[PDB]
Amino acid sequence: AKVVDIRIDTSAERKPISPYIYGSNQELDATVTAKRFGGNRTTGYNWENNFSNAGSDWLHYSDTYLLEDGGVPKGEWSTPASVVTTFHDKALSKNVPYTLITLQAAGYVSADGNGPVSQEETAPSSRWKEVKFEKGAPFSLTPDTEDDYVYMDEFVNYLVNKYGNASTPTGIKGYSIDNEPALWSHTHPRIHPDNVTAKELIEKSVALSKAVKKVDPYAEIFGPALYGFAAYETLQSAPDWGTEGEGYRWFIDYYLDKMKKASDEEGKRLLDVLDVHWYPEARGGGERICFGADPRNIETNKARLQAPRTLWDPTYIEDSWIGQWKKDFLPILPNLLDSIEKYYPGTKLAITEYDYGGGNHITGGIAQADVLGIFGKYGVYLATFWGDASNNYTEAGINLYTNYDGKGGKFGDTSVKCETSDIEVSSAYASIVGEDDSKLHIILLNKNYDQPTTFNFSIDSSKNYTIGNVWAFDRGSSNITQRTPIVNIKDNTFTYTVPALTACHIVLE
Ligand SMILES: [Ca+2]
Numbered sequence: 203a204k205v206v207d208i209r210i211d212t213s214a215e216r217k218p219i220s221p222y223i224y225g226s227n228q229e230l231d232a233t234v235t236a237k238r239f240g241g242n243r244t245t246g247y248n249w250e251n252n253f254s255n256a257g258s259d260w261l262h263y264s265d266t267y268l269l270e271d272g273g274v275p276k277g278e279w280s281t282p283a284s285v286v287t288t289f290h291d292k293a294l295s296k297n298v299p300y301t302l303i304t305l306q307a308a309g310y311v312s313a314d315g316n317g318p319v320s321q322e323e324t325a326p327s328s329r330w331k332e333v334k335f336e337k338g339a340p341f342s343l344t345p346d347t348e349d350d351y352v353y354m355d356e357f358v359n360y361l362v363n364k365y366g367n368a369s370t371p372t373g374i375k376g377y378s379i380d381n382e383p384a385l386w387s388h389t390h391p392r393i394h395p396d397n398v399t400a401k402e403l404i405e406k407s408v409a410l411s412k413a414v415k416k417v418d419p420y421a422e423i424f425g426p427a428l429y430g431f432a433a434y435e436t437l438q439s440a441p442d443w444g445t446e447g448e449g450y451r452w453f454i455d456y457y458l459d460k461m462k463k464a465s466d467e468e469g470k471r472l473l474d475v476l477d478v479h480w481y482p483e484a485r486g487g488g489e490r491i492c493f494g495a496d497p498r499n500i501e502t503n504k505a506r507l508q509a510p511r512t513l514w515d516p517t518y519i520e521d522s523w524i525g526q527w528k529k530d531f532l533p534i535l536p537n538l539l540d541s542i543e544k545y546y547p548g549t550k551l552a553i554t555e556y557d558y559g560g561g562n563h564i565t566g567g568i569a570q571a572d573v574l575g576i577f578g579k580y581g582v583y584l585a586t587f588w589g590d591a592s593n594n595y596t597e598a599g600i601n602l603y604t605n606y607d608g609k610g611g612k613f614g615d616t617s618v619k620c621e622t623s624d625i626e627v628s629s630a631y632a633s634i635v636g637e638d639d640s641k642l643h644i645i646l647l648n649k650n651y652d653q654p655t656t657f658n659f660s661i662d663s664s665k666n667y668t669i670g671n672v673w674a675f676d677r678g679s680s681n682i683t684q685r686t687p688i689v690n691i692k693d694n695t696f697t698y699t700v701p702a703l704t705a706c707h708i709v710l711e
């Protein structure tokens with residue numbers, strides 16, 4: 203039998219878990235705690251008329267896709283910002299406390315919904331409106347659709363007028379500086395044909411942040427929404443990186459340092475949240491764990507289970523180009539957080555797109571639960587999964603934290619010390635509520651593929667626990683079901699054997 207010791211000390215290493223790590227980009231069958239309006243379609247979205255452009259995703263079409271996909275009623279298609287107000291209204295109706303709205307920085311937004319934009323209609327042209335961050339004339343709630351410009355501060359003003367500012371109960375809390383700027387010239391060449399420079403990205407980020415914060419001083423600015431590691435390192439070989447990056451280990455440090463400098467000159471914080479996208483490059487069984495992975499490939503599934511360790515564990519070297527060539531930047535979350543500490547202390551960290559794959563397989567659910575445990579433990583502020591409602595095991599992984607009992611039961615909001623003797627076969631995360639250890643929550647993941655694992659728990663707490671109720675999912679179902687409670691707790695010790703490939707949430711009282 204495989205035997206693993208779990209040691210918890212409810213008084214030790216206490217740290218808040220940000221509530222907003224359990225979010226999504228799409229409409230999921232899960233209770234989520236943040237919603238992001240972002241990704242490729244948001245770069246060219248025009249709040250005045252709701253048109254947007256597919257870019258490379260579909261023939262550079264300008265059309266009504268976001269109206270249709272967001273479920274906006276036809277009677278509101280010509281109402282300013284109806285894509286965004288439907289998106290936020292839906293989030294509020296689902297009791298989601300954080301909405302993150304992407305603002306447009308690549309330079310232009312769709313003028314029309316008339317179909318493909320030719321290369322000869324690359325902006326500026328009749329097919330586009332130029333974005334300015336500051337109107338510099340009085341705002342209107344009925345923006346002028348006939349002129350040549352779309353104003354970001356006027357868009358924010360419309361939202362704040364409707365919902366209140368970000369400090370209020372219904373306000374939109376965060377705005378993103380566009381999406382994947384190092385891919386603008388690939389995804390949106392008809393808006394931004396040139397490869398983005400580091401200098402342009404800082405100039406725009408600073409200017410947009412200033413413009414937003416004049417309207418809503420409480421709103422959080424997120425950037426740069428980088429697509430993946432090569433953008434973290436060099437802004438995708440940006441044309442000015444050889445000069446701008448002198449003395450910087452990677453583009454992340456340059457971005458933090460320059461946003462801090464601009465904030466110090468301005469006299470207020472202009473970057474609230476360092477925002478990146480992380481689609482694992484980890485491979486197993488001869489393929490990446492996401493983007494077309496075969497769920498029959500057991501070696502891929504095993505690699506998916508271990509891949510979350512690249513986020514935090516210095517001993518884990520994944521099979522990928524990042525694991526091979528970029529060891530100096532792994533594990534990735536401590537590297538990002540260390541950069542924040544060195545170059546812009548107090549900046550938060552968000553993972554605004556990610557997907558570990560296997561979302562309809564038990565290993566996608568276990569990996570998802572592991573990732574959410576890591577985000578909480580290591581201090582990520584906000585995270586939003588990218589993927590649809592067919593990812594039933596990913597959704598179970600989210601609900602294990604946000605709604606394990608179907609009536610709103612949730613993981614605690616204060617992380618506490620919880621160590622496993624075998625980080626390969628298992629993960630375990632523990633939390634309490636506020637400062638109170640009366641209820642101790644434990645997420646316990648058995649990564650053993652084809653055998654049970656016996657866990658010997660030893661807990662140091664101010665309480666003497668007498669029952670552990672249990673909810674779990676497994677290969678039999680992604681529905682989270684209540685299991686027999688743990689009852690033989692002797693001096694805050696117990697033994698609990700869990701079947702192969704099972705994810706559990708234990709609630710001790
Ligand atoms: Ca206009």
Ligand SMILES: [Cl-]
Nearest residue numbers: 382383384429
């Ligand atoms: Cl990018």
Ligand SMILES: [Zn+2]
Nearest residue numbers: 231591592594
């Ligand atoms: Zn689903």
